[model samples]
Target: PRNTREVFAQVKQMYKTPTLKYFGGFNFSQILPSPLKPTKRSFIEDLLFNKVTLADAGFMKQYGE
Candidate 1:
């Protein structure tokens, strides 16, 4: 989400208009000087569908999730 509105707006357009050939859901991520699991964290951490969600415990919980 580096440029947030500016970038995501363009991404949303891809969803608003018809396909120039459809693709999977458009993806986006903002990189930063974040703490990686080297301290037990990674991805987007406790936010969104990120590391916390993709972590082993989270993955295992998928059955009930």
Candidate 2:
């Protein structure tokens, strides 16, 4: 099993990588679920989704449209 906090932290870091700019934009449904939360949904489920656009925008600027 994986640790939710650690895995989410790593995923957060991945969003900060400039290389993610190549993706243009990201839709949560399309992303693979974290092994730590296998039955759970995408990072959006925990990070943004219906919660905070400000945080989402920050992450998007790093990798989205």
Candidate 3:
């Protein structure tokens, strides 16, 4: 399972042939086209969800301290 750190790192390494432009305005979501592409949610969406959950856990852990 890819942890929060790996997910965070993966996004930074998307400079090569980016499916979405990262300049002018930072687009955070990654989308794709073609067969079964638009049929499902983007991979970045799932990764972002993971990050949110992890962040919540971290927040709770810190809150308890």
Candidate 4:
């Protein structure tokens, strides 16, 4: 019960490890100007009009359907 200092340090290091390696380090400086912007709306709307296919949905491959 008294020798948990090393375990505590290990836990801290494990939790602090970079989990977003693939996404590139986490960034908190660039804040969103607005929750929903016009550009985002247009993009989503365009995709909506076209409708996301099973391939885009990740259910099927590009030429599967």
Candidate 5:
């Protein structure tokens, strides 16, 4: 199982690679092809379907005030 933090960190790291260029007034963009790619629906589903806790048990355990 992958946590949200790791997935987010990976995405941020991918942005370090340059895939765009500009000359005068024209812009040239190229896709950064890689064996690993990011998916939207997978994380969207994780956030929507898999993130819910019925009673907020984890939050209560962390902040019991």
Candidate 6:
């Protein structure tokens, strides 16, 4: 996974769609920074997958699960 700055850079470099709607109509460069968690915070069974549902779905949709 990429940090905010790296994600922004990659999207700027590689995104080529002409209209915003063609690429979800959202600006990747404008994504708010999230807190860094260097290690897994819980065992898989204890993790709150629902808490990250939107972001996880975005990654899966863009990159494939």
- TM-score top scorer: 3
User: Candidate 4: TM-score?
Assistant: 0.22
Please give the lDDT score at residue 34 for candidate 5.
48
Q: Which regions of candidate 4 are displaced past 4 Å? A: 15-21, 26-65
Tens digit per residue, CA lDDT, model 3, 6-64 = 67677877767645455654444535444544736565678678757777678778877
| Per-residue lDDT of candidate 1, residues 1-65 (tens digit) | 36555776667666565444667344455443556446455644546656355577866688995
Task: Return the number of clashes found in candidate 6.
Answer: 0
Which candidate leads in lDDT?
A: 6
Candidate with better lDDT, 1 vs 5? 5
My TM-score estimates for the predictions, one after another, are 0.16, 0.17, 0.24, 0.22, 0.19, 0.17
lDDT of 6 at 54: 86
Question: What tens digits encode model 5's per-residue C-alpha lDDT throughout 1-65?
Answer: 75866777677677564544554333344444447756865676666745575546777687866
Winner on lDDT between 5 and 6 is: 6
Error of 3 at 34 (Å): 24
Q: How many collisions per candidate?
A: 2, 0, 0, 0, 0, 0
TM-score of 2: 0.17
Query: Residue 42 in candidate 4 has what lDDT?
Result: 62
Residue pairs with backbone atoms closer than 3 Å in model 1 (clashes): 37-40, 37-41
lDDT value for model 2: 0.64
Cα lDDT computed for each candidate against the true fold: 0.59, 0.64, 0.64, 0.62, 0.60, 0.66
Ten contiguous residues minimizing lDDT sum, candidate 4? 54-63
> Tens digit of lDDT per residue, candidate 4, span 1-65?
68866777676666565565679565576663547556765676667656655546675454576
Ranking of models by lDDT: 6, 2, 3, 4, 5, 1
Candidates 4 and 6: which is better by lDDT? 6
Using TM-score as the yardstick, the better of models 5 and 6 is: 5
Model 3 backbone overlap count: 0
